[PDB]
């Protein structure tokens, strides 16, 4: 395919995406020194998707990391595989990016959008053709939500043709020090719905819930959850990274997946839930993967899909596997759950098969759905926002920073209309 | 790397500043001849004590503060007190005639002819600064100089510097040491014209300080050296956060963020616990759990109001010496006994703690003695409406029959100002009462 440009925002983005780069780089078998270790061509069939050659025809990841809190550069260059990146895009701010919008959205950051467009165009010059973008960020704080929406709009202006994809992390009361989050989340998704092509709801509420109620870890840190999300988003990327029969692409994924012109929020899931292990593992086999793919406590959104409907479905299986067996159980799952799925698009539950095992697990898969259950998450966020908003709170910060009340009101109008749209498409008929 | 400027207005303000600056000397080991052996005597600083002392090439550590008085009766005393050599050649402000308990005289007649000099002094001091956070002004609601001139100063500052914040320390004057009867008009007329240019203001009630000194200090005659010393100790304890070194609550901006939800609600209430009686050598020992247990008692707060009737916003804390955060967590668990505690539904809760690894400093030859641990809870309660209601009762009584009104009208004020300020304070107390 054509090349992909990766964009990384804020502390959360930098950490999550650095771990993701590590995960796939191990998967594609590339050394920290850029040395080559892979033992087959099937590893480098789609290495050009991300990695670019060096002067020594040494493959280098192509990504950009953005933030304003200048303490992140050393965090980048202190990870295990951190020094992997080109010493040209470690461009950051110098005076902090306190979690206030219109500071990174209007006040500043808008002064460095020239810098970020300069760097992204500079490294897409070496890109023979452009496929799309990978913005990783979270919905809280300026560097993060505000910069992410600003970047999305800017590149949408400059590149109206290609695709625009992003990963969303929604901060939650369960693990959050600050409290100015719901304002950030709603102000973000308002830009996000109307300005991107597809987005992944990598939630924290469901993440914490499952990690504490089954994985039962004492202190969910930026280490554990970083590992979880890096693994899952690697699993999502595999389908493009691998050659598959369901030989899907970003534009193809949009066309196949996108049901409405404003409902492009996915629910990345993973069947074999995995903590920080040492040995190979305790063994898992096919029917276990079948069951745990679509359980109630394995996704990344605190919702039970049996209370809703799927617009579409998608999966990407891993490891040496019986394709006929897989098709048999999938046919049964689409047979024994007739009401579970929408009647608007038959032949929606698509399936693919991959070969390279995950670097640590034998037989796994990667669930990338598109449900009508996401209304629960959006309703949650909007309700907490308006609870913080019915009486003013810190809102003087925003108003004195540049917004007005009308922008907040219209953001809520847009979100509640979106929830109405999801409700409507969730209660269709024949 | 972040400068700070303070300023003293009025007799109460200048006396408090006198009582505070020598405490500030003591804390860092600064002495009227001190040199703080770890410095180069040429700007040796940029630590958290640089925010006040802009030390010169003479190794002097001159401060950043000026004192205001409409008629020299206390500013002279600091000019010829103890730390005489500690101030510049006539950097201070001296007048010729006080506002004499008349808000109007300082707000329209006298100060409106002296203010420009004060602003020139403030600007000239600020020029030597590089990274000023904001101002910390000391005044009182009692007289007309420390009140009318303060409100006028607020207007002038907000005109010339609106971006920067400016924390406030105020006194809610009490009948006990009442040196007038026209205080309530000044108080309403100052709180009404303070909001639009205020950001966060602390009131310390001379009723409360008087009660504390008479009860738990074994003093029956609280001069302006006893209550003054106690308030200086409280102020030093509260500002120690920015003063000594880095922890919770570094900056005035951070004060606002973690304290004030709603710009019409920005009067935080400060509580204390260690009230060491006197030179009494031996009573018993002390525990950190004990002092944090005591910091909830209504008798031990800087302003009289019983908070078992209302809800808190953000109950910060500070500590001196003997770190033990597990004991602090136990303290939170204990105070969770929900007998007299509350929080507000909308926003979650945080008991942010910052530790100073220096034992609290004490007045050497004063009514106290050195201890090892200290703590001060700045609970932004909703109960702070008691003071406003109490003062509103008296203002309404006096305005019933238009008493004393001429002494304000005949000086450059209109009759409608009183009514509109009363209505505005009514709106303010409504804004407190509705939260819940
Ligand atoms: C009702 O009173 C309350 C008071 C406090 C609390 C919890 C209290 N609150 C907050 O400030 C949370 C969001 C308000 C934003 C506001 C809305 C954004 O514009 C900010 C801004 C940033 C920089 C410059 C100018 C403006 O501020 C902050 O995030 C700042 C970060 C900066 C100052 C380092 O502080 C923190 O992040 C803290 C203090 C470490 C996070 N923690 C808390 O325990 C709860 C209640 Cl209910
Ligand atoms: N220093 C100090 N002042 C106090 C105390 N209690 C009350 N005051 C106030 O001290 C004030 C005297 O200073 P101002 O208010 O400026 O008096 P003024 O008449 O405006 O002008 P000056 O007397 O020249 O200062 C009165 O308003 C009292 O309410 C206390 O314990 N210490
Ligand atoms: N660093 C980090 N933050 C996360 C993660 N998952 C959720 N978050 C939340 O994302 C928010 C961090 O926002 P951030 O990007 O730091 O805003 P910034 O201060 O403007 O950079 C916090 O609410 C975190 O709780 C994670 O894996 N890593």
Coordinates of N, CA and C in Angstrom, one line a residue, chain A residues 24 40 76 87 94 117 119 135 173 181 202 216 231 236 250 254 259 270 288 291 316 354 407 414 420:
Chain A
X24 N 5.2 -3.7 17.9 CA 5.2 -4.1 16.5 C 6.6 -4.3 16.1
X40 N 12.4 -13.9 7.4 CA 11.6 -14.3 6.2 C 11.1 -13.0 5.6
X76 N 11.1 10.0 26.0 CA 11.2 9.4 24.7 C 12.5 8.7 24.6
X87 N 16.0 12.0 14.8 CA 16.3 13.2 15.6 C 15.9 14.5 15.0
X94 N 7.7 24.4 25.4 CA 8.8 24.8 26.4 C 8.2 25.3 27.7
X117 N 2.8 21.0 10.6 CA 2.5 20.8 9.2 C 3.8 20.7 8.4
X119 N 6.7 19.5 9.4 CA 7.4 18.2 9.6 C 6.6 17.1 8.9
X135 N -3.2 9.4 14.4 CA -3.1 10.3 15.5 C -3.5 9.5 16.8
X173 N -13.5 9.0 35.9 CA -13.3 9.3 37.4 C -12.5 8.3 38.1
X181 N -11.8 17.1 33.0 CA -11.8 16.2 31.8 C -13.1 16.3 31.0
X202 N -10.7 3.7 22.9 CA -9.9 3.0 23.9 C -10.2 3.6 25.2
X216 N -7.3 -8.1 38.6 CA -7.1 -7.8 40.0 C -5.6 -7.4 40.3
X231 N -0.6 -3.5 22.9 CA -0.9 -4.8 22.4 C -2.1 -4.8 21.5
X236 N -4.9 -4.6 16.0 CA -5.7 -3.9 15.0 C -4.8 -3.6 13.8
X250 N -7.1 0.8 4.9 CA -7.8 1.9 5.6 C -9.0 2.4 4.9
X254 N -12.8 1.6 6.1 CA -13.8 2.6 6.2 C -15.0 2.2 5.4
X259 N -21.0 2.8 8.8 CA -22.4 2.6 8.5 C -23.1 3.9 8.2
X270 N -10.3 -7.7 22.5 CA -9.2 -8.8 22.5 C -9.7 -10.0 23.3
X288 N -12.1 -21.5 23.2 CA -11.9 -20.4 24.2 C -11.7 -19.1 23.5
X291 N -15.3 -18.0 22.4 CA -16.1 -17.5 23.5 C -15.6 -16.2 23.9
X316 N -9.6 -10.3 13.3 CA -8.4 -10.6 12.7 C -7.7 -11.7 13.5
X354 N -4.6 -14.6 10.1 CA -3.2 -14.2 10.0 C -2.3 -15.4 10.5
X407 N -20.4 27.9 22.5 CA -19.7 26.8 22.0 C -20.0 25.5 22.9
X414 N -24.8 18.9 19.8 CA -24.3 17.9 18.9 C -24.1 16.5 19.5
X420 N -28.9 10.5 19.9 CA -30.2 10.2 19.3 C -30.0 9.4 18.0

